Amino acid sequence: ILGSIILG
Amino acid sequence: ILGSIILG
């Protein structure tokens, strides 16, 4: 989420 | 981005 591939 | 939670 939030444009982060870590967070999704 | 673009007003989206997912994209940031």
Tell me the resolution in Å: 1.2
If you write DSSP's letter for every residue of chain A in order, what string do you get? -TT-TTT-
CA distance A6 to B4: 17
Count Cβ neighbours within 10 Å for each residue of B1-8 and write b for 16 or more, e otherwise: eeeeeeee
A7 CB-near residues (< 8 Å, 6+ apart): A1
Instruction: Give SS3 for B4.
Output: coil
Distance CA B8, CA A5 (A): 11
Partner B, chain A 1-8, Cβ-Cβ below 8 Å: 1-4, 8
Residues of chain A neighbouring B8 (CB-CB closer than 8 A): 1-4
Q: What is the token pair recorded at A3? A: 């444009």
Inter-CA distances, B2 with A4, A8, B7, Å: 14, 16, 7
Contact present, B3 and A2 (Cβ < 8 Å):
no
Contact B7 A3 (CB under 8 A): yes
